[PDB]
Nucleic acid binder design. Sequence first.
DNA 1: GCACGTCTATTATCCTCAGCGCAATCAGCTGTGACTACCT
DNA 2: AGGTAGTCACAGCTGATTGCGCTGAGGATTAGACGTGC
Lengths: 322, 677, 56, 118
Amino acid sequence: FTSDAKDKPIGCSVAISTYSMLGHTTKRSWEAERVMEWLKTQEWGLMILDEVHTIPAKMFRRVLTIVQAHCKLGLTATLVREDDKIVDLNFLIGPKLYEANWMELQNNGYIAKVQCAEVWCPMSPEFYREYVAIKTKKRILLYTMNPNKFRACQFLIKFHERRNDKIIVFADNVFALKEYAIRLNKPYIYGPTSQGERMQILQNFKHNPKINTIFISKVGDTSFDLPEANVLIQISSHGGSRRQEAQRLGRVLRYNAFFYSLVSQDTQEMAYSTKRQRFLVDQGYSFKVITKLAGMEEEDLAFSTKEEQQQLLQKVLAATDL
Amino acid sequence: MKLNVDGLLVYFPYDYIYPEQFSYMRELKRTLDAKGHGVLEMPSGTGKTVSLLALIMAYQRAYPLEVTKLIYCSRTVPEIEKVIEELRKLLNFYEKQEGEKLPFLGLALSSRKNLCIHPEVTPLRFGKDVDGKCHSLTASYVRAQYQHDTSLPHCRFYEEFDAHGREVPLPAGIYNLDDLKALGRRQGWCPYFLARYSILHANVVVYSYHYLLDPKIADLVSKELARKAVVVFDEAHNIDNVCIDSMSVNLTRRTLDRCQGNLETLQKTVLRAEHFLGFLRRLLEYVKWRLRVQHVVQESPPAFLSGLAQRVCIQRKPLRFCAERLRSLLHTLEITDLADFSPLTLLANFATLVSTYAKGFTIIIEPFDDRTPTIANPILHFSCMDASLAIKPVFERFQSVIITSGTLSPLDIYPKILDFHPVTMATFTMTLARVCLCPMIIGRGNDQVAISSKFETREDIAVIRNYGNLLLEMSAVVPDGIVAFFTSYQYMESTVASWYEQGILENIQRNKLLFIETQDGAETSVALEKYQEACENGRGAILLSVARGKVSEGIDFVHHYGRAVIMFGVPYVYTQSRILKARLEYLRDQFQIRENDFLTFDAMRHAAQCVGRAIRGKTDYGLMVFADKRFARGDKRGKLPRWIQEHLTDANLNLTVDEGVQVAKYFLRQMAQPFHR
Amino acid sequence: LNLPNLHRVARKLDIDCVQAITGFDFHGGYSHPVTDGYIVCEEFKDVLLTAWENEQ
Amino acid sequence: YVICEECGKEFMDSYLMNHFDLPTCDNCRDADDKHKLITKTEAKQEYLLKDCDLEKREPPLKFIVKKNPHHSQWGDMKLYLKLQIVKRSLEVWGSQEALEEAKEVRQENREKMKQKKF
DNA sequence: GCACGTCTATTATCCTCAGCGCAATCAGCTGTGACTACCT
DNA sequence: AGGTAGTCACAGCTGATTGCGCTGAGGATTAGACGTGC
Ligand code: SF4
Ligand SMILES: [Zn+2]
């Protein structure tokens, strides 16, 4: 029941739908209205909720009260959430039943032993002056488009492609991701592209040796059907969302694999990365700090000279969204 | 084993029951309790028959009064023999699990050629003369003259059956056609005559569609057998086509020449009643008038008799006496054989049909021929237009007619194509331990150009190059046989000629052997045999054919035969001949059927019928590809059977050739691992 | 009647309209018929003229 | 027998009854003005009706499929009875009332959207 | 008498128009995280 | 010093619109024979 095929939801044993449709605050579709009227007239056994962590919302909570069910079973992988609304989930649904021990889970070999990495790059002088000069929230793009971080990401991409490893590159701030992906001429998901284009890109991502690296803009921050990947490189993620980082780490496991996080020194990204890894260290993961990359000057990388690095300043300051 | 349905227990030869079979049994029991008709859809040719027979036997045991006679009409003789042997296996299982016999009789019916013991008529290959020779050898006059024991060669099986086979019945023992022939030859009886005598005291019987859809024989074979009976038409996705062809006749120069040749002999025999002797003589010239008239088309189903009553001024009533004349006058003339006589009978049948049935028909005359259009060929065909005409006598005489096949995806068009009142609307999708089929629709090629089989782009070079490249790089990933279907023979030959012109067909040849299906039956048979023997070893081969051909349904591509089935474009029937358009108009103004909707339904029905023959059996697996962007639209995907819809993910609906090849490689690589039962 | 696009008006009115041939031109190495107006029934002539004027 | 709503004369079968279940004989069949047939798209545009309002709201509205003179192979025009369409529109939107303001605010919103796009 | 350059010819074939149903597109609402300012 | 109302960057969803795809029917434009040079 998602207003896409309408496979006669009336008179069904198991019904599968999504949020934001059972709690509509506006006028509803006639067929959808009739389906909801039918659905609100009978009891439900074992109402299953997915991604329960984002249950305590303004409209998602009343979804529990808008339908009647006997048992409410919630499933999630990242129970961590800000705004301390997880306590509300104790009485909204029930108590925390089971919490898997990830360390012993990966010790059995059924979960990939991901070697977590936290490697930072120094801020180029052409960028740090502008970073310390501006404070009105325009510095988000500055450390995001750090030339040193760009070189590190390109080096990691090339190294892992040379050994035939599937790579997923997470990157928020899709504006930066545009010039981050078109520079290397690699597929990227802007996010409001289409439904078909994303599906075919992800479908040909796995069974193709020619292309094995993609860029994602906050779209992979949920439970999707992304294929198996061994390398994850996140750049300029959200502020302090431990849930987002835990989900991104969850997209790799299924040292079989390893994921890297790139941050800029002497910036808010350092504090953000420090405060958003406290969930995984409680889970047992340790983030090794990498300050030097072997063979950085062995091959040619982008932004080799200062000319294009200083040219990047004009285009990164060209936003002027006022 | 013993399956416990909600109000009965049914013995099943196989201990393990798939959920699809259980749901099918549930639905069929519901229909039988509903005392009404219905339509079903199953994806397996095998395993449906055993479940159907088991449920029928259980229902007969539970309710002997409700069900008395069973009909399992099928398409051809192999289906008849396989269902007979399946019933034999079921009966043997019941006997070994129960220990006592039951008075159930099961026989198979076919043509007199199939069931005959005279060695003087078997070697000949004349299906229109075997019945005539059988009638000449033994008939009412033969029985009358046998009293004096005339010394002349005649069939003697009946002369012994009428005195010895009309007293001993066959209460128990289901008999196959070979069993019937053996019993007849050991008892000196005709298998056909004992079959006729034994149908009354019988439990089940199987035969072809022609014994029920054709009114000229259904009444003789089924008149008062059982008022309350159950009939099922398995594999009847093309029931409308055969129903239309049942009341369809054709006329050519050969028919009229044969009639004018044989009427002189008939008159010579006569001069050695009068209401028809002079009546038959002048009928030929009215239809020969259209031979000398050079007109494109004449349509007048009601006014044809009006025009007949003008040139010769003949009443319409005596036409209705023509058919009943066949059994009366001819037997008085003592016809030696039906050779050189069938066109005269079919002319009378046509006259009776046009005299009686003219409400939903059309008369068409075509002065066109293949490669010799206008020399001398006015073909008159009394093509039927409504499929309900051939289906009324079975709906009004039966209670729970069931139409089931492997492709009945639109359940809303069959109840309105023919007058029908379904109460089921039931579909079933087979499930196994692994996905046995990987359907996918290939849109634009590597050049980002659509490969649609559009009429305006049939001669386009780019689409032909893309088709050739797809067939080449596909032939190297799926081994031991690929079955490709084209729209028509003309398009197929024009495509292969273009491929031969370029240096591309050699690349396919060096990978797999290419075999082309032609109209010749012997050539097609030998091509199929050599394709099978080439696919037996590692050579591999490609079988190129047409969707609307006798090879599409004549053979089944079981596992290891045709791992991939390719559809080169949506198969659309040719709009010419002014026959399809008449049916479209009739459906538009009568059943409110959209012309485009019906064309799409027919195209997708043929495509699914010719693509679903690659999966026969649970262990069988195969690949199915559609090489046309037009398949990508929902209006055509929705016409695919439900057991293929769920496996056609939205990810692969418009993917290019390279990604389709990659998907095929992954599917074949992952499907080769052992699975358990 | 020598009216341009008169056939289209006749087609929309389902009125018989046949092109009038007055000669043949041999331009381009081949003979092509020359069409001068359209021949329409006088009974429908009055109705056709008004319809053609409205269409124009 | 069926009693005509215009003349009251009993009849067995009529064109309107067969195609639209309308109890009106062919003698009183005013197919030119009162029983005018309009295309499906035209009815949806004029009366702002949706497919569910035409196929799912009881009673279901029947239609007559006729060939398109302009082009043969295109989808044939679906003709609905104007009286039934008007009755359904009145049942859905109430009457010839505020729906008229509704179409005005719809075109106003269209102008707002186009100026916003500009 | 032979071959080459030049003047002329008594009906055929190929690029562009026309209503409905499916898929693409935007408006409105919400989530999720941080940022920020004013009052108790 | 902490709580709350806004504000902003991305993302999701569903509810209308809203141009685009299904095929057949229209109006445009090289070779044979004669003069002549060898
Ligand atoms: S009566 Fe039977 S055995 Fe004799 S010719 Fe006919 S079919 Fe053959
Ligand atoms: Zn009346």
